[PDB]
Amino acid sequence: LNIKTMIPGVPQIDAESYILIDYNSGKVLAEQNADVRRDPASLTKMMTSYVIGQAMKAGKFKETDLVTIGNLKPGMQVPVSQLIRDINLQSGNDACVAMADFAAGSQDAFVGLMNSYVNALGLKNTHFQTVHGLDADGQYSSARDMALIGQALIRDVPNEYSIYKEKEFTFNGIRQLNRNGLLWDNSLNVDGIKTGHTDKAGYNLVASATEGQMRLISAVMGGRTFKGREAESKKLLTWGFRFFETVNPLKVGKEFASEPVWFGDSDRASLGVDKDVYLTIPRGRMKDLKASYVLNSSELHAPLQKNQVVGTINFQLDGKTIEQRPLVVLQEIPEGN
């Protein structure tokens, strides 16, 4: 029933590894060697910028604060806004060392923070050695881990992430461009990430684009040619938006169902979810998306705690449950008698 339930063929991507994920759902739309350990090269500055965003989020320093350059010439004073624009748009290696020392006291302690953020994110194939990644040796990542770093940037530090769409900034009366060529592509709404090239790392790009409420993240690593620098990723984004859509069937705190309660201070339980429901399904099939729920006991008896789990919501497509979520009590019901 062949055109409704059709599974699209993934385009040909000329690179060694790639992954395409939906920012909200976390769904994996396409993947090839996504867990293979490779050199991220200057994609390493994504994690560097993540750690800086977290420090600014926590109030440790601000954009208007002044940084002294040490061992861009030594002893000049540069605002944080400039140094992080240099890191984010230009990938400047100087600015990474000046910021690591400002923020963490030394490079090594900063590297120590990079790698604990790797474990906090759950990344299983990334490890850093320097703040900048210049050393063609020894440090590694994967297309999957790099896209997950991209997502955490957008999610955890939105004030850091908003800097990556700036097209230009002025280092000292010197106008500097963002190096991410996809920002000027009028066919897409790209607002991110990082570009990097090393003869052994190949061409690498972590991009993010939006269409409607939908956000996609791609990571292509070890791209083989100059002319596919931007084009390969643009293929993959475009493909993902053409065949898929992300819908949001249920938000936190909304009443999904209502069920009778025995023995409490009220006779009805307001039921829902404790986390937002985002799903990624084949474009155009929403009106076929059905939701239903099953309870774990026949009668809901009091007491009920707020966010207690009393069942499961089953999201279905073609008689296929594509996702299940815990159904929770949205408002506490103390035992009445």
Curated annotation (Swiss-Prot):
The keyword Iron-sulfur does not apply. It comes from Escherichia coli O157:H7. Pfam families: PBP5_C, Peptidase_S11. GO terms for biological process: cell wall organization; peptidoglycan biosynthetic process; proteolysis; regulation of cell shape. It comes from the Bacteria. Belongs to the peptidase S11 family. GO terms for molecular function: serine-type D-Ala-D-Ala carboxypeptidase activity. It is a peripheral membrane protein. It catalyses: Preferential cleavage: (Ac)2-L-Lys-D-Ala-|-D-Ala. Also transpeptidation of peptidyl-alanyl moieties that are N-acyl substituents of D-alanine. Pathway: Cell wall biogenesis; peptidoglycan biosynthesis. Transmembrane segments: none annotated. This is D-alanyl-D-alanine carboxypeptidase DacA. NCBIfam families: PRK10793.1. Keywords: Carboxypeptidase, Cell inner membrane, Cell membrane, Cell shape, Cell wall biogenesis/degradation, Hydrolase, Membrane, Peptidoglycan synthesis, Protease, Signal. GO terms for cellular component: plasma membrane. It is found in: Cell inner membrane. Its EC number is 3.4.16.4. PANTHER family: D-ALANYL-D-ALANINE CARBOXYPEPTIDASE, D-ALANYL-D-ALANINE CARBOXYPEPTIDASE DACA. Removes C-terminal D-alanyl residues from sugar-peptide cell wall precursors. The keyword Hydrolase applies. SUPFAM superfamilies: beta-lactamase/transpeptidase-like, Penicillin-binding protein associated domain.
